[PDB]
Amino acid sequence: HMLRPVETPTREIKKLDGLWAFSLDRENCGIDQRWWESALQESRAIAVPGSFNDQFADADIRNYAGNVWYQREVFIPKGWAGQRIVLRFDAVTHYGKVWVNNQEVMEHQGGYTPFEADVTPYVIAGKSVRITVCVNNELNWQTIPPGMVITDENGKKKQSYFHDFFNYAGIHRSVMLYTTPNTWVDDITVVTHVAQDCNHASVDWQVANGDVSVELRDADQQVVATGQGTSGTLQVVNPHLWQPGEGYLYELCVTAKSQTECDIYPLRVGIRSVAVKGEQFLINHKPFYFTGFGRHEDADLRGKGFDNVLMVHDHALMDWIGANSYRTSHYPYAEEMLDWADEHGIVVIDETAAVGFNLSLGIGFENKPKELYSEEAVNGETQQAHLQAIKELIARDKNHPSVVMWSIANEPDTRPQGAREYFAPLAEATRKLDPTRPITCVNVMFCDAHTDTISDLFDVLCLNRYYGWYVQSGDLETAEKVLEKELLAWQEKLHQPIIITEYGVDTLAGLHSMYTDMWSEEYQCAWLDMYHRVFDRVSAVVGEQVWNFADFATSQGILRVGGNKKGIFTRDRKPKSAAFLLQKRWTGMNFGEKPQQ
Amino acid sequence: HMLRPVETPTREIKKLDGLWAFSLDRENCGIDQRWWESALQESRAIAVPGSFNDQFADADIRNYAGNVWYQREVFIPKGWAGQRIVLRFDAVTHYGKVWVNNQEVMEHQGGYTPFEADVTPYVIAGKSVRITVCVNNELNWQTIPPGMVITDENGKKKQSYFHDFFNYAGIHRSVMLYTTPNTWVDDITVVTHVAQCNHASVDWQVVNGDVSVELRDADQQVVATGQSGTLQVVNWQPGEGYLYELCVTAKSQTECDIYPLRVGIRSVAVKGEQFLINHKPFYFTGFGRHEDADLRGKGFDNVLMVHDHALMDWIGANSYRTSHYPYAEEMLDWADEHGIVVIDETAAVGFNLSLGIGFKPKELYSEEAVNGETQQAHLQAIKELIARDKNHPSVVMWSIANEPDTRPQGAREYFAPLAEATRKLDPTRPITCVNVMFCDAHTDTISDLFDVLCLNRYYGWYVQSGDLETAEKVLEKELLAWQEKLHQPIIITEYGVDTLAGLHSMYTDMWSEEYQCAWLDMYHRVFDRVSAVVGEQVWNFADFATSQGILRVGGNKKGIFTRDRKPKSAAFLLQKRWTGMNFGEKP
Numbered sequence A: 001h002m003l004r005p006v007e008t009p010t011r012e013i014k015k016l017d018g019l020w021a022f023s024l025d026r027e028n029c030g031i032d033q034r035w036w037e038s039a040l041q042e043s044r045a046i047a048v049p050g051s052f053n054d055q056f057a058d059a060d061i062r063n064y065a066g067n068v069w070y071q072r073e074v075f076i077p078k079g080w081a082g083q084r085i086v087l088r089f090d091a092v093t094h095y096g097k098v099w100v101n102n103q104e105v106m107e108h109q110g111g112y113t114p115f116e117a118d119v120t121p122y123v124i125a126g127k128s129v130r131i132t133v134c135v136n137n138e139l140n141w142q143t144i145p146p147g148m149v150i151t152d153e154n155g156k157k158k159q160s161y162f163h164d165f166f167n168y169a170g171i172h173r174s175v176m177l178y179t180t181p182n183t184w185v186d187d188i189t190v191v192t193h194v195a196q197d198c199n200h201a202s203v204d205w206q207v208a209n210g211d212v213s214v215e216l217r218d219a220d221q222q223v224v225a226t227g228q229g230t231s232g233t234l235q236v237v238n239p240h241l242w243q244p245g246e247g248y249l250y251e252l253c254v255t256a257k258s259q260t261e262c263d264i265y266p267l268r269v270g271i272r273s274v275a276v277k278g279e280q281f282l283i284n285h286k287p288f289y290f291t292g293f294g295r296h297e298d299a300d301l302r303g304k305g306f307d308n309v310l311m312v313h314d315h316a317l318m319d320w321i322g323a324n325s326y327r328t329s330h331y332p333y334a335e336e337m338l339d340w341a342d343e344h345g346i347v348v349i350d351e352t353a354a355v356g357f358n359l360s361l362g363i364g365f366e367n368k369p370k371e372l373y374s375e376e377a378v379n380g381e382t383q384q385a386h387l388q389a390i391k392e393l394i395a396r397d398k399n400h401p402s403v404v405m406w407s408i409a410n411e412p413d414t415r416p417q418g419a420r421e422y423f424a425p426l427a428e429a430t431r432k433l434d435p436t437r438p439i440t441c442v443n444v445m446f447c448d449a450h451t452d453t454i455s456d457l458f459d460v461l462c463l464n465r466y467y468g469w470y471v472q473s474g475d476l477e478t479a480e481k482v483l484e485k486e487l488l489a490w491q492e493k494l495h496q497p498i499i500i501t502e503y504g505v506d507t508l509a510g511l512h513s514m515y516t517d518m519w520s521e522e523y524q525c526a527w528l529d530m531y532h533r534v535f536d537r538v539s540a541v542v543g544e545q546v547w548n549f550a551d552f553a554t555s556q557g558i559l560r561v562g563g564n565k566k567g568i569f570t571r572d573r574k575p576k577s578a579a580f581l582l583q584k585r586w587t588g589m590n591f592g593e594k595p596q597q
Numbered sequence B: 001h002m003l004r005p006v007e008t009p010t011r012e013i014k015k016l017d018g019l020w021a022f023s024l025d026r027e028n029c030g031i032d033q034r035w036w037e038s039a040l041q042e043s044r045a046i047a048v049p050g051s052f053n054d055q056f057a058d059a060d061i062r063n064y065a066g067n068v069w070y071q072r073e074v075f076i077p078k079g080w081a082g083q084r085i086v087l088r089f090d091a092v093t094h095y096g097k098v099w100v101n102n103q104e105v106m107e108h109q110g111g112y113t114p115f116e117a118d119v120t121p122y123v124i125a126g127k128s129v130r131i132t133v134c135v136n137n138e139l140n141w142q143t144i145p146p147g148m149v150i151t152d153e154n155g156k157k158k159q160s161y162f163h164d165f166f167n168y169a170g171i172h173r174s175v176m177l178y179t180t181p182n183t184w185v186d187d188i189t190v191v192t193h194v195a196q197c198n199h200a201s202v203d204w205q206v207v208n209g210d211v212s213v214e215l216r217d218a219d220q221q222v223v224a225t226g227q228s229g230t231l232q233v234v235n236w237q238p239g240e241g242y243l244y245e246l247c248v249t250a251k252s253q254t255e256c257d258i259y260p261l262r263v264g265i266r267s268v269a270v271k272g273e274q275f276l277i278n279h280k281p282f283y284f285t286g287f288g289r290h291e292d293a294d295l296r297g298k299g300f301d302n303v304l305m306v307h308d309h310a311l312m313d314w315i316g317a318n319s320y321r322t323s324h325y326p327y328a329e330e331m332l333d334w335a336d337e338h339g340i341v342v343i344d345e346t347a348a349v350g351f352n353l354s355l356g357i358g359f360k361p362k363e364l365y366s367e368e369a370v371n372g373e374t375q376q377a378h379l380q381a382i383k384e385l386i387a388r389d390k391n392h393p394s395v396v397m398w399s400i401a402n403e404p405d406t407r408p409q410g411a412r413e414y415f416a417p418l419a420e421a422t423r424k425l426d427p428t429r430p431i432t433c434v435n436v437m438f439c440d441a442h443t444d445t446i447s448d449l450f451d452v453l454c455l456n457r458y459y460g461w462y463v464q465s466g467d468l469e470t471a472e473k474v475l476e477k478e479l480l481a482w483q484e485k486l487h488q489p490i491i492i493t494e495y496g497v498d499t500l501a502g503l504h505s506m507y508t509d510m511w512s513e514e515y516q517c518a519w520l521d522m523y524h525r526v527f528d529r530v531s532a533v534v535g536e537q538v539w540n541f542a543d544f545a546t547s548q549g550i551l552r553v554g555g556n557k558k559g560i561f562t563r564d565r566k567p568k569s570a571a572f573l574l575q576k577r578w579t580g581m582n583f584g585e586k587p
Ligand SMILES: CCCCCC[C@@H]1NC[C@@H](O)[C@H](O)[C@H]1C(=O)O
Pocket: A164, A165, A330, A361, A411, A444, A445, A446, A464, A466, A470, A502, A564, A566, B359
């Protein structure tokens, strides 16, 4: 049971603020020598939140595999003698184990979701405790995402993985201590139903030794509904709906009264209905059309570290270009992202970190498990770890009205028997963990309409298609034919709504061509344009998401010229020519509505 | 039998004055309708020499597969009534058929060598004859280099091939008309020997005329003289490059003809781990190159040659390999005449089906692919190279092919006749065949049919990508493995990494100028530790155009220079090494 921290009977002191002591451990003696005991040797200042790889311009820190130590002292605020205090890590990429002054208090696997522990017994209010963090950036076959650690003859660990983006690690987001009353709200769940768009209710179901009443206050803070019951309610309402263009928010505030002290938790709600009918995706009983991007949490110097200016600027760009939706590509994003999405009515495809369950999308000319689904590779523990990743993503983003669909994985290889054996239970478990949202699994190119094995276990079909790029390279005529043929094949086979969640081409900013050859800005424009002409001719396609909003870092190889260049913007957010192409189509269309051509 | 035209009793008018009428033939009725009848209509100006693909900024012309039509008139000069006059094409890339006013005067297959024909019976001096050329850019398994044409559903041709560089086509070189006296020399052959202050120069000046030969100096003052066959004693070095001149007089009583031909006195041979030029241990330094440049494609251009040679001289290169095809004959005149060491190579590239991109005949040596006809065309291509560059002193080694796959059974049947035959087509030059990375020491089948073996190695790039410590270990161990395994001299004909000009990194990540620098330095330190290898040639001198794909960012970016000839940081690195060593002597 987890909620995002906020105010009044609750209060934060964040240690996000500032520089920590940081150290490597090339021989992994930190645990043996109990480094959490003393203040570190060999410590250098590092900034949190932020990846550790790019911060020191050193290829050895950058390419490190192992454990790293983050440590900082802090003064525990003194008006906190009688309240309950928690230590919350909003993300520690891959694995983290924390000591609060010689006392292990938490441990976590999963680099993208928050994890907290009550630390009341282990701290002296009014004085300073020392926080030590042990961070592991290693991936094996039971981590979400999977990878393999390669140890050379000399014990240097080098991490290989099967996804594009670079394996940035560290404390990527918020680290804070926050206090709730000893009687406190611990979890909230809100569900919205709507009929003729002027007439429904907000079911609730709450959970910590406190009798609870909930007021549903206005944007004007005018109250229009009231309930009581730990097992919640159905507050019935005639309302203004949370819509894609505007995203209205009521405020449902839950009051947890114990007979002495009280706690109250403010939770914003968007009144909207999501469903799939035939080949139509409907938000509030109207067929929506998705436009926008796959994104990444990547940026210069800070890696995957959260940054407010970046969020403000990237939403300004996305707003300008006319995007209405995005997918949290290949891991759960910072919650600040989803909060922004709620206030602005941005439609979001929420996705777990389950990427790389595929051993066919390689560079060439170089020792893998020859069976993807097996005891050596993706096995039962992997499945359990995956289900737990689904449970953490859902427990954190269930109430967000902007999250409109759950993505279980991205681009697994579905051809082997055992893909369906691995995925079907996860598809079912996910539906039972949130029956109010449709479910998806993003589908790779070579698992075509004929060969794919699991897409009928999901509500929406999300395709990643690169005809004319990785195959039929340079050939816009042939690729157009292939793309039309496979889209009609998919619509014939499943009669589900189709979103093209990935389509894009590597483009060097400033490379121009009078031909329309690959890597050129002219080719990025003509290729996106040919895709758009096809989408507009297939009734089932309800959504387009250009593969990347910006250029991002990847591991080194012959396929990646300083990373992935499929961005519409450069890594410093400057637009390639295709940006204006996109802006013309996406602002020239009626909002949320499929282009009539 | 071939040699370059010159002017003392013979005379040229080049039709290289570029603007010819040019046209495509997209429904392939040109041969049927005999377009050579009339002047081509629906015609647009084109520049000759130059590839036709890039001249028009048109992607449909650029990617065309089929026949194209080149046509121009010329006024044959009237002081040409009694001499024999020849129509000479220095190269028509892939295939060419010429009409001189309906009389189809020639044909040629093989896009990198000249072909000439006497057109006296079909020409009237003092008026203009209509020249029509049909050039085909298509490749099959029986062509040099090999390829496959696949036709899509609508009769649209796509040409696929297996070499990196782009398949540029057209009239790439000189087109000249030249007139000789009716008793004329047709071929010359010269061989030079040298001992450890003195030696001889065989000749055989195959012509209808008696023979007298003058050996005039740079002063053109005489040093030996003969009268078919000789063997003359005397009493050409890399840094300096001296050239004597033998002048051939075909003396007839009816008329006379003379030919001036330059000669270089030097000896080349190998054994142990040593390649010796005039009995001295050489070290090759320099480049794999390409005939590629903006707008003109593979078209020859004098400014380009002057500038690129300034660059190679500055950076400290003493040698280059005519990568994947025979270069401009003018290239070799410059190299003879400037003392550049040239590793000469034919167009035998793409005999390999193993490292293409990701995302075909199932056995390379067989009738479906590499067959007996391929053997013939390959032998003929080897022999045309031999006939045109036999007299050039700058050629120091002949390359029979580049980067074939040696692992399938049958490579040694295809190859053995070509190595024996080619050694038998000139014992005065050593022979090599450049072998790919994946045919390593244990796996390669044929490295012993050649005098030197030349390695193209890219460890740290295509394998162990970015892993420069590990790549170092591999390069050292398999280099020593090769030295033990054949005890031949080794030249590294290819080593380089794609480098985007202006991409810089505080790490040393691939595609960065820092990475090119660090990678080349590691390779260089590796060679300094193997007594055996006597030659280093950084893979490409300049960035060049290739066919489109996910591996090539607007072409191959392994150049030391960009395509507009601007230096990456590694350029200076190379200059330091090649200027910092004593000439021809490796650290
Ligand atoms: C042949 C299949 C190619 C799949 C390649 C498409 C990949 N999908 C997942 C994304 O994270 C990658 O960046 C994208 C790519 O490589 O740019």
